[PDB]
Amino acid sequence: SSGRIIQIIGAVIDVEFERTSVPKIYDALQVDGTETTLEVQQQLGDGVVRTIAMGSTEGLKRGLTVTSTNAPISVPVGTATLGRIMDVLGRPIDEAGPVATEERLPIHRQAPSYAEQAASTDLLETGIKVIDLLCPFAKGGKVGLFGGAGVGKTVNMMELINNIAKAHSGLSVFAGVGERTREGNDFYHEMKDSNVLDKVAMVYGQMNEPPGNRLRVALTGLTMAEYFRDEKDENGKGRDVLLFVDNIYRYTLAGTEVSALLGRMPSAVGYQPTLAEEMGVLQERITSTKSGSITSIQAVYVPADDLTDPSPATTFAHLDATVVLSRDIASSGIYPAIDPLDSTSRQLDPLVVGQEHYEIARAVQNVLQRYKELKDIIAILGMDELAEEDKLVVYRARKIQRFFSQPFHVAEVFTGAPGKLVPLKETIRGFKGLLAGEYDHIPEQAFYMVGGIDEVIAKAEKL
Amino acid sequence: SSGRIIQIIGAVIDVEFERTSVPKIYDALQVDGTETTLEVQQQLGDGVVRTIAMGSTEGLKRGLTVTSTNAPISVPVGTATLGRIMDVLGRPIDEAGPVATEERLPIHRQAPSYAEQAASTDLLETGIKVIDLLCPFAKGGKVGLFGGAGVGKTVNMMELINNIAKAHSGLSVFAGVGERTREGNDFYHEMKDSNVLDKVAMVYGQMNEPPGNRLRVALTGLTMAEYFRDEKDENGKGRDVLLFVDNIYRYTLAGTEVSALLGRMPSAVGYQPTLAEEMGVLQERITSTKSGSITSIQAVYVPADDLTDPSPATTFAHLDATVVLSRDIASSGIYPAIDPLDSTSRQLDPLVVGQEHYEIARAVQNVLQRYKELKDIIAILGMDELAEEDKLVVYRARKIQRFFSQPFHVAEVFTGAPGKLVPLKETIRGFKGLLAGEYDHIPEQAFYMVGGIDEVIAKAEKL
Amino acid sequence: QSARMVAMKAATDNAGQLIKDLQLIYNKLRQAAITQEISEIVGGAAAV
Amino acid sequence: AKNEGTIVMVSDGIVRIHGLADAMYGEMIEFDGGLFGMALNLEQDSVGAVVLGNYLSLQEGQKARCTGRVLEVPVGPELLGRVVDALGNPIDGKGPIDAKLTDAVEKVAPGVIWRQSVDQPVQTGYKSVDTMIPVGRGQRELIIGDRQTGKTAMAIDAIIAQKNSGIKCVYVAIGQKQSTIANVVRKLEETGAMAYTTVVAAAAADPAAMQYLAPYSGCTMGEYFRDRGEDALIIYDDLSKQAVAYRQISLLLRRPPGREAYPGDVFYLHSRLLERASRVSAEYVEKFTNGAVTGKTGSLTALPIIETQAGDVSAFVPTNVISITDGQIFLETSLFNAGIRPAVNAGISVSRVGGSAQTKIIKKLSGGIRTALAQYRELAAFAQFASDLDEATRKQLEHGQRVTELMKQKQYAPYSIADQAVSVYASNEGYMADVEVKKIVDFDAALIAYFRSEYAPLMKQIDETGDYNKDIEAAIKAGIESFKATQTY
Amino acid sequence: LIIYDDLSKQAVAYRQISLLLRRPPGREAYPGDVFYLHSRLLERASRVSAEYVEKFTNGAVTGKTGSLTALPIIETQAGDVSAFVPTNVISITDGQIFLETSLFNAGIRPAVNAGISVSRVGGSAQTKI
Amino acid sequence: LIIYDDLSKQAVAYRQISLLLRRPPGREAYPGDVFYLHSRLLERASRVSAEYVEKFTNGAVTGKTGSLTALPIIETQAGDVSAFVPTNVISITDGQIFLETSLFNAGIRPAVNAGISVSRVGGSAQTKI
Numbered sequence A, B: 001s002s003g004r005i006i007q008i009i010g011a012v013i014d015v016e017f018e019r020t021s022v023p024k025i026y027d028a029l030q031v032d033g034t035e036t037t038l039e040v041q042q043q044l045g046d047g048v049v050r051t052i053a054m055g056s057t058e059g060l061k062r063g064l065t066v067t068s069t070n071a072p073i074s075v076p077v078g079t080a081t082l083g084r085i086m087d088v089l090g091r092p093i094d095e096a097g098p099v100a101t102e103e104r105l106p107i108h109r110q111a112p113s114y115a116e117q118a119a120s121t122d123l124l125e126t127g128i129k130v131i132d133l134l135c136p137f138a139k140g141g142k143v144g145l146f147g148g149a150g151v152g153k154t155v156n157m158m159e160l161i162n163n164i165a166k167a168h169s170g171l172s173v174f175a176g177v178g179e180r181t182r183e184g185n186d187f188y189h190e191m192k193d194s195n196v197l198d199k200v201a202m203v204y205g206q207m208n209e210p211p212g213n214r215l216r217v218a219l220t221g222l223t224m225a226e227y228f229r230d231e232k233d234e235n236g237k238g239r240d241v242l243l244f245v246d247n248i249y250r251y252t253l254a255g256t257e258v259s260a261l262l263g264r265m266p267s268a269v270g271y272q273p274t275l276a277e278e279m280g281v282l283q284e285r286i287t288s289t290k291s292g293s294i295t296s297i298q299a300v301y302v303p304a305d306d307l308t309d310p311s312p313a314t315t316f317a318h319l320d321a322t323v324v325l326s327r328d329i330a331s332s333g334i335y336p337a338i339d340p341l342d343s344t345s346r347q348l349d350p351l352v353v354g355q356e357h358y359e360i361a362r363a364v365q366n367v368l369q370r371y372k373e374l375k376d377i378i379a380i381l382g383m384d385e386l387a388e389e390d391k392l393v394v395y396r397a398r399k400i401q402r403f404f405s406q407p408f409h410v411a412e413v414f415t416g417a418p419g420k421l422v423p424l425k426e427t428i429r430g431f432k433g434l435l436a437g438e439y440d441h442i443p444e445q446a447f448y449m450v451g452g453i454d455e456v457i458a459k460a461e462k463l
Numbered sequence C: 001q002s003a004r005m006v007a008m009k010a011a012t013d014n015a016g017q018l019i020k021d022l023q024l025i026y027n028k029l030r031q032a033a034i035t036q037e038i039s040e041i042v043g044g045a046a047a048v
Numbered sequence D: 001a002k003n004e005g006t007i008v009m010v011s012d013g014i015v016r017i018h019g020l021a022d023a024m025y026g027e028m029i030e031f032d033g034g035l036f037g038m039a040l041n042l043e044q045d046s047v048g049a050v051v052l053g054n055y056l057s058l059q060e061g062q063k064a065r066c067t068g069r070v071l072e073v074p075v076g077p078e079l080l081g082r083v084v085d086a087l088g089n090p091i092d093g094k095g096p097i098d099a100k101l102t103d104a105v106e107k108v109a110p111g112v113i114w115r116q117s118v119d120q121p122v123q124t125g126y127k128s129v130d131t132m133i134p135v136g137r138g139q140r141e142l143i144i145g146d147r148q149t150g151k152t153a154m155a156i157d158a159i160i161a162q163k164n165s166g167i168k169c170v171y172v173a174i175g176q177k178q179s180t181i182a183n184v185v186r187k188l189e190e191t192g193a194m195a196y197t198t199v200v201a202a203a204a205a206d207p208a209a210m211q212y213l214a215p216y217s218g219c220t221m222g223e224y225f226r227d228r229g230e231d232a233l234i235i236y237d238d239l240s241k242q243a244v245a246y247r248q249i250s251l252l253l254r255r256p257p258g259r260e261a262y263p264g265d266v267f268y269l270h271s272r273l274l275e276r277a278s279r280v281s282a283e284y285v286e287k288f289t290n291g292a293v294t295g296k297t298g299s300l301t302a303l304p305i306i307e308t309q310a311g312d313v314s315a316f317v318p319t320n321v322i323s324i325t326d327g328q329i330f331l332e333t334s335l336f337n338a339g340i341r342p343a344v345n346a347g348i349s350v351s352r353v354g355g356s357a358q359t360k361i362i363k364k365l366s367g368g369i370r371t372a373l374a375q376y377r378e379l380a381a382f383a384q385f386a387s388d389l390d391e392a393t394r395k396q397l398e399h400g401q402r403v404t405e406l407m408k409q410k411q412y413a414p415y416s417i418a419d420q421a422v423s424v425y426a427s428n429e430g431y432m433a434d435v436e437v438k439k440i441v442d443f444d445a446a447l448i449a450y451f452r453s454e455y456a457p458l459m460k461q462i463d464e465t466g467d468y469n470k471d472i473e474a475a476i477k478a479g480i481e482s483f484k485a486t487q488t489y
Numbered sequence E, F: 001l002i003i004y005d006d007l008s009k010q011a012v013a014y015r016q017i018s019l020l021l022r023r024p025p026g027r028e029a030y031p032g033d034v035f036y037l038h039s040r041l042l043e044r045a046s047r048v049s050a051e052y053v054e055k056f057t058n059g060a061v062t063g064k065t066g067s068l069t070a071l072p073i074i075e076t077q078a079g080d081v082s083a084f085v086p087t088n089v090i091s092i093t094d095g096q097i098f099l100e101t102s103l104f105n106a107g108i109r110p111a112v113n114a115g116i117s118v119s120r121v122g123g124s125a126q127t128k129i
């Protein structure tokens, strides 16, 4: 049978059915005479369910009719989604006709079990000095970027895509969750200008959409990536998959925006009481199993520049490598503004990267920590009273934080300088030479926005 | 067509009327057999209205009969209110007979529209040399008074009332929001000791009153000032009226106390949700129209010595000038004790006052600041290191400091000095001549306690 | 003997700047704490 | 009775109606006295509506009526030069407006495929903004700072500078006293900028609903030109007052708050509004106007204004808004009170569009200035606890001081492309190394005056085209040398 | 002359009673009229004129002026002079006398902190000497 | 020997369950009986006497004692050990081992801070040498 709308408050609507036809928890319903789709959330008894609209609720009135479909939201999958743009419901929005497949998969499913887990056993180079030295990546692992507003998350993501995804042999999925439409258009035209549009699929729900679209838009891209991961060919092996997610924080924000209207009580600083559970449900699906592997990079937003806030604090435990950006470094003109005393990685142990790399990283971090310690007494008092070793430490640390800057390829519009790519061997050579003391006569201005140590020597000599 | 009390909780009273006789918002009700006025705050349905009692509620009980006036609280207005003292309801409390006039005006009224605004920004002349040069006033503006007791605030109030009554033939209204009874009695007898009582009206609200009275006591003075401004003589010139508010911080505190009593969710640091709207609606009726102009002067107290607090910030959103009194100046016997370097006004701008006025003010401030800087070296390292232009600056700064004092009209009864009302054009000439070095031979004592430059010349020729 | 006083005056100025910044941070924290306590009290009151 | 009801509860500008069965979400409701409301809550047996006006004349038992239409305001070229309120009703006394159309207030921005990248510059007249934080057609740029720092002056100068470019302007005032609005209107009218400008006013005494609804009406008015191939520009004054009003409404609706007592969806309120400013492509224009206009692109530029407390850019709402726009201009009190006006913080301000939103000569000349300024600021801050200074540090410091003194301007005094280009070339090639620090402003003014006096055709050619060539650079260098040799400052 | 031992305990008891009577709490669960609780108590300490006494006694007492003096006491914790009830009280009185623990522990018996202690009435409430 | 890797996450899950059942919350929205939750679990680790073992096994085991050691783990936010949850666990347990970020980043590994680390059992649980 069919139900009728009895109450609407913002994005939350509830429908009343008969006692013998109440839909299940995650079913999809359609409003007759309209293009509005509703997803059930709770069962309240007496044949009443509470749903969330997947669009604008303007022009909706009490007493309309709603028919059920007895199935969750299903989206197309396969090779027919490569080179196309889709929305949360899987409908094309690129003005290029319909999707040419027939397979469908539900967007809600359980996570892989404990027995079907694999161990990442491969390093992956990037060409970025600080990331390579102090936070190595692993093929098949999870990476996250932490930062406030306007610190360089998008630029670093684009540079990582340029350095890795271009030289890739596989497929890719890009999901946009509550970001700018201009960035999406720019990325689409950048990919279309080159000939890599045939290897990627895009899903877009941005900040101008109702909370219903922003809530469930990541699951569609996750489903597409999951289907691509567990895909085999007759006499053909599987394919590696790269997944990119933009501002996974908007998913939890959209969950927050509708918690009160669903009838719950707030916790912590106005957050929903089911933050960790609904974060983990999504996070446990982004993983690599015995049959296929996934490499993912996510951007995490830090509200009000507070790393203690519950959302990033809960997110911290779901990643293998964490990169933290600081506004203090960015405001000093140093790009990329990566904080070297708060970035860690599970690959940084002597059994995986070797002895020399580990010693270099440890020495660099020790010098930086010592300089940060000395800062206060340097500031309030003078500098003459310091010990000579402290002066050497100060100069070396300043040169070290100068040497971590690098010009990017995708940042040529902002500065006008060509990009540089540095192999990690040159980085290790330069940092070992710097810590040894061979470059104690070079001015600290020569270490700014260069590539290897040879460029430092040339720039110093030209000065 | 009569209602009755159904519920009493503290100072909140609920009254139930008949369904076709319900009163409107802000109407005033009368309890039959007693003397209590109830002000409507909101409606609830089924003929039930939630009100607030003006005064104490001891002795009341449920079931008492109440009748409506179908109008807001109306107070008597006219020239018969000059020299009298009244409460929030417009009733004498000074034991001097009933108010003679019959005219009435509601205390709730819409602010003047955008089409009624004045077409210019004139200046309000005070006669005080320091005020008119460094923190000039402006018709229709709002001025905040800083500094506690022991430096002279009430005396400045006397002088402003007297000068505005003398020069521009205007009147004044004084409203006391949460005032001490001892200090209020002292102030009233201080005005009565002089002959200023006959040119100003009082409405008094004291600390031991219910919070409703301390909230609706500024509107009575506002209505009286509005009537004084609107009435016109031959040719319809209009009048300039001065309004005195005892403390706007206590107005805010009464607002949040009433909001808490009514049962509203707090916002920010404990304050009520409608802080800015309330203060704007209070300050939007103080403006300069084509007919006349109402100017207000209020005392400002910064809670916790933190300007970032919501109420001082909302205060500073409207203030056009701030006057700060320092105890250090009063320690040297220079009265009135007004600090030149810390008092600011938005009117000091070459567009508004012209080129020469702004330049003279800036030069005076620069000289005073340089003298303050040289004080430390004079005191610590000795006098000998200072000569030539340093001592020129020292002498000019001392002369400027002495020249900022003048006798008042209200103190002539005590010390016998008649006092002076220096026009604005005279001060600029004197200060410009002083800065140029024309009076470099006059002794310092000739600049003391004198009205204008001619008086300085006479004192110098005598001394 | 003529440079020690320069050292001390510089130190005093730096200390004044330090206490200014610390006072700003303290005021921010105090406002945050008051807001959090009021919100907690209201939430506890509503749940009953 | 399907479209009739009665008022049941009245409190604080929010009323409760019982009976409007065939009521839509956001539908307009008219009361007995000629007032209007907007439905917000379609409860099971009641309707909650806010009143768009003065509610003191409403009592329980009155009548309510549905109109069958959503909120909409008039639009067109007839609104230019007038002053209206949030509903489009005139308040200047010049008579009724005769706009021929209406337009809904709540809409959704065009999708991903319908947009186009920003490549056309917009000139504000300021030497620092143009060469450090460029603005283009379709970009959204934020002006943020403390109180009395010079934000409205920058906005009004940007509006005034569009005299010749032929783009339309809209000014929205939220939570301001009437006298300030009148003064701004007078200043706009004297300069002639009122001939192509509209003003929407929501004063401090207006209800919170109108202060919350005014920016949407302004954006709807400004979108008329974008959809038909023209260009526009909209300014939001005190966008934080809208958040304050929305917080008041939500709290009076008893909804649980978050940080600083703000509602949960305070981000959506601003993201839904600021996403409507963009640049659309020719295909979208042709589809919208049914082929009446072809080969033309539309645009809509936005300049929101937000105020902070004690220069705290790390607050909830400033950071909530910084993450939406395409850049920001930060004004700091420390430089303002010290005599550096405009007080643009080089290290904090940034533009996301970059060098593609400025002319060729300015893009080529002004590269890496902002990062160098930030590095100089850091070095100057650090170099107070040392006396042994090397040559590179001294040169960097003394170049940074000159660069800082170069970026100083006066209000109501716009600059041209040629003046900025020649000044930047003079600074970049070290022609001001031997100039004393306190005579930089006189040097710049004298150089501009002499260059205009003796090289008019070159300045005119640079003004019209804004191109860069070897002969142009040689002529610029020769003129600078000729000024340095003979003229005195 | 009346001595109020500690008004803070009175405020605490008032808060407990108000909470038990389910009134809407404010800051620190205090009801909305704590200032009304303290100010209206402190306003009854006053000196009245001779005409008031003559009216009250119907001429039994002719040329006398009454009076009443209060000496309230407030306690702090490590010099927290910015809490709710202490600030409410400090806003009402006509002077303050400050005593600090660092003085009594040191060995000062009066332990009066003269730095921030002032009297508004001043020299009028003294004798010639 | 038992080891709980995070009692904070258990407290978070318990808070979610309690809030979904509409029980009155307290400080930091935690329920009233979190202290009971941790205490009635941590009190089950101890040493028993030989008589208890003899009685439990009905004479199967004669001359031996049993024990159960616990090593809970608690994570703080920016070194704030004054939060609601960590204080209860600190009060319940005997000793604490504090690890610091500044020592870890400075090369001291493990990052034990001996200034505020205690063991109430002391030398009674050591070998002679």
Ligand SMILES: Nc1ncnc2c1ncn2[C@@H]1O[C@H](COP(=O)(O)OP(=O)(O)OP(=O)(O)O)[C@@H](O)[C@H]1O
Residues within 6 Å of the ligand: B349, D146, D147, D148, D149, D150, D151, D152, D153, D154, D341, D342, D409, D410, D411
């Ligand atoms: N470039 C400039 N040079 C000198 N003075 C300036 C400059 N720009 C603005 N001013 C002046 O500085 C003051 C700033 O006023 P303005 O209205 O622009 O500030 P605001 O930030 O909008 O303040 P408010 O908080 O009142 O809205 C005005 O007196 C203005 O004339």
Ligand SMILES: Nc1ncnc2c1ncn2[C@@H]1O[C@H](COP(=O)(O)OP(=O)(O)O)[C@@H](O)[C@H]1O
Residues within 6 Å of the ligand: A148, A149, A150, A151, A152, A153, A154, A155, A156, A335, A336, A407, A408, A411, A414, A415, D323, D350, D351, D352, D353
């Ligand atoms: N390597 C870099 N070189 C120059 N500018 C940069 C660099 N990285 C970031 N920026 C600047 O920082 C700003 C923020 O970049 P973006 O990542 O797009 O925003 P967000 O950090 O908010 O995602 C950009 O406008 C850009 O100008």
Ligand SMILES: [Mg+2]
Residues within 6 Å of the ligand: A148, A149, A150, A151, A152, A153, A154, D323
């Ligand atoms: Mg970002």
Ligand SMILES: [Mg+2]
Residues within 6 Å of the ligand: D151, D152
């Ligand atoms: Mg302004």
